[PDB]
Design a protein around this nucleic acid. Structure first.
Ligand SMILES: [Mg+2]
Ligand SMILES: [Mg+2]
Ligand SMILES: [Mg+2]
Ligand SMILES: [Mg+2]
Ligand SMILES: [Mg+2]
Ligand SMILES: [Mg+2]
Ligand SMILES: [Mg+2]
Ligand SMILES: [Mg+2]
Ligand SMILES: [Mg+2]
Ligand SMILES: [Mg+2]
Ligand SMILES: [Mg+2]
Ligand SMILES: [Mg+2]
Ligand SMILES: [Mg+2]
Ligand SMILES: [Mg+2]
Ligand SMILES: [Mg+2]
Ligand SMILES: [Mg+2]
Ligand SMILES: [Mg+2]
Ligand SMILES: [Zn+2]
Lengths: 66, 116, 83, 177
RNA sequence: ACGACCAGGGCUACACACGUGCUACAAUGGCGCAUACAAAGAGAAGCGACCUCGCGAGAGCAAGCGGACCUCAUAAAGUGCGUCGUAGUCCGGAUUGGAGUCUGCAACUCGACUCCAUGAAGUCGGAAUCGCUAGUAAUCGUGGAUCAGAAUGCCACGGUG
RNA sequence: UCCUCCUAAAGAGUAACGGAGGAGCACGAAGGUUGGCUAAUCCUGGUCGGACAUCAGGAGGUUAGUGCAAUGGCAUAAGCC
């Protein structure tokens, strides 16, 4: 890379709510606190839940009994 | 200041900046802060990140932006596909709830369309 | 809508016609003036010609058509446009 | 070089197994990542281009190459030579480190993230995606920015087919669907 | 049959134009808590306490009352404190989705109300135009008729002024 | 008046109130040199982005380009940085 034209690119630490401490090289400078990472993202549980059609006959039979 | 995907203004209070979430209102925002043990008059500033993690978990208890918009579009397109009266109103752009269409249907019908 | 404690509503003559066409296993179109009858889950798969004021429009009955009434699938006002 | 080491140790063994290649050089590998921002609105002001390149320099720690119009078209009101976009080519370690921050940080920060497409592989393994909003990278400060940009990421790899790249990214647990 | 009976539909449609109203565009205000002061009315197929349950509309049991006795029924605006701090906002509440209650054989077309969510237009209105001279206008609530249910309309009542 | 092609009969040249088009400049770099590069178009994928901007790959192989008319040239590029 060239010398002067580029921004400062320094290794910092990014910790998350799941405690995923990860050291990366970045242009942030300061340390970073995340909210969700790929470890704690609900891609492996929430997307399983996320179809959510629901039943019409079962809602009907749910509302009462004959 | 980043809940459920989106950012949240810091200068506002707690219940209001939560109500910025598509899916909560003043009631459910009070239920959130009550379940987190957080007062409503404090700001999103001077909050602990553990307090915000509790807040994120409490919001994650409910149905929100992408989920809620997906469920809403599914219910409307269910009526579309059935071809009921509510579906026909939803796809003619007319009011569903039994209002008048002779006059004052301007929310569903938009601005005025002049006869040319 | 109706209270849950009253349960649903359906005409008796409709519910008897449904029980007959179920046991007979006929898929004949049942013409019906009961636009206010709630669809039952045992009604799924039937052609029912609901009245509209002028004629009987046939409605094939789907699962999703359960928690509704028969009148929702028989529109009474014909509108095409002014121009 | 965390993912480059993870490549060299586990992905090559995986793909040699799941494809039964004669040679290890026959395996796919990533080659470059190209980051374009097509800014067609800079004909209003240069500063929109000048600030979008500043934003993209924070994402990837390189000064972006301001791209220009190859020819002149009148539907877009541009002449041949006008600066009309910006790109960044990423190779080597800076490529791997960006690709880590991408699939680890920024993709989870997508609003209503629900996966990628497996139908974005240009017939020859090279994958292309487009992000709607630059704030998913944490390099950008939310108060400091004003305009929602968007960019597109293009991962150019050495995979001959389309599935060998699909399996390669799946080996990097790339969230297709 | 231009007469009579029944079911269902319609009188509620919708490119649009007009009239009369309601609610607003906020800070002389919105919200939250506490608290003070009315008049005039209705009630037996009715008014319906108290207590319990419900976030709620309401449900159950259930007194008293043909009523200066009981019920509808706590008047609100106001005042005291805190809050927001000029933003399409903690303004505004339309619309739409879901869940419900009640009336009634029956709320799909086509009821009212509640709860959760949603949060349009609108930042004081062109040409033009209306009402009002004092307890008036303005504004704030209250009640009744019709009525199973269903008024922003109508007819009445007092408060501030 | 000047330029390009045909007529023009395979050297040159060759007429008509014959058939068709242009010029009466520009450039202090659009010149010199060194070094490097190689198009048009189309296909697929891809945020705003659209028949058509920018990006990545592939076909193609000069069908492009040449300061301007036409003809002849041009990859060792005379084309492009
Ligand atoms: Mg919200
Ligand atoms: Mg009428
Ligand atoms: Mg409000
Ligand atoms: Mg009454
Ligand atoms: Mg209770
Ligand atoms: Mg007060
Ligand atoms: Mg206050
Ligand atoms: Mg609302
Ligand atoms: Mg507006
Ligand atoms: Mg304003
Ligand atoms: Mg007078
Ligand atoms: Mg009534
Ligand atoms: Mg010759
Ligand atoms: Mg000769
Ligand atoms: Mg000859
Ligand atoms: Mg050269
Ligand atoms: Mg493109
Ligand atoms: Zn994480």
């Amino acid at each position: 890379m060239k010398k002067d034209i580029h921004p400062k690119y320094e290794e910092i630490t990014a910790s998350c709510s799941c405690g995923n401490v990860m050291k990366i090289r970045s242009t942030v400078g300061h340390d970073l606190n995340l909210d969700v990472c790929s470890k704690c993202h609900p891609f492996f549980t929430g997307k399983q839940r996320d179809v959510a059609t629901g039943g019409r006959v079962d809602r009907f039979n749910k509302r009462f009994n004959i | 200041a980043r809940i459920a995907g989106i950012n949240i203004p810091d200068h506002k209070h707690a219940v209001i900046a939560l109500t910025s979430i598509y899916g909560v209102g003043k009631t459910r925002s009070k239920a959130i802060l009550a379940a987190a043990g957080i007062a409503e008059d404090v700001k999103i500033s001077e909050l602990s990140e553990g307090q915000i993690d509790t807040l994120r978990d409490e919001v994650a208890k409910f149905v929100v932006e992408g989920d809620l918009r997906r469920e809403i579009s599914m219910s409307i397109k269910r009526l579309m596909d059935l071809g009921c009266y509510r579906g026909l109103r939803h796809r003619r752009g007319l009011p569903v709830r039994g209002q008048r269409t002779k006059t004052n249907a301007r929310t569903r019908k938009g601005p005025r369309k002049p006869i040319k | 809508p109706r209270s849950l404690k009253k349960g649903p509503f359906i005409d008796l003559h409709l519910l008897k016609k449904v029980e007959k066409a179920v046991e007979s296993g006929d898929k004949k179109p049942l013409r019906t003036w009961s636009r206010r009858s709630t669809i039952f889950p045992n009604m799924i798969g039937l052609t029912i010609a609901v009245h509209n004021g002028r004629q009987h429009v046939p409605v094939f009955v789907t699962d999703e058509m359960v928690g509704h009434k028969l009148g929702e699938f028989a529109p009474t006002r014909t509108y095409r446009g002014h121009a | 070089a965390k993912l480059h080491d993870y490549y060299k140790d586990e992905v090559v063994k995986k793909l040699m197994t799941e494809f039964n290649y004669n040679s290890v050089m026959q395996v796919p590998r990533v080659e470059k990542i190209t980051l374009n921002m097509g800014v067609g609105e800079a004909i209003a002001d240069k500063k929109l281009l000048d600030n979008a390149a500043a934003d993209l320099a924070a994402i990837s720690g390189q000064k972006p190459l301001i791209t220009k119009a190859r020819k002149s078209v009148a539907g877009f009101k541009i002449r041949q030579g006008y600066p009309i976009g910006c790109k960044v080519t990423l190779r080597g370690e800076r490529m791997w480190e960006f690709f880590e921050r991408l699939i680890t940080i920024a993709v989870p920060r997508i609003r209503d993230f629900r996966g990628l497409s497996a139908k974005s592989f240009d017939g020859r393994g090279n994958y292309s995606m487009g992000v709607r909003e630059q704030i998913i990278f944490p390099e950008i400060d939310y108060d400091k920015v004003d305009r929602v940009r968007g960019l597109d990421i293009t991962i150019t790899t050495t995979a001959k087919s389309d599935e060998e790249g699909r399996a390669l990214l799946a080996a990097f647990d790339f969230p297709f669907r």
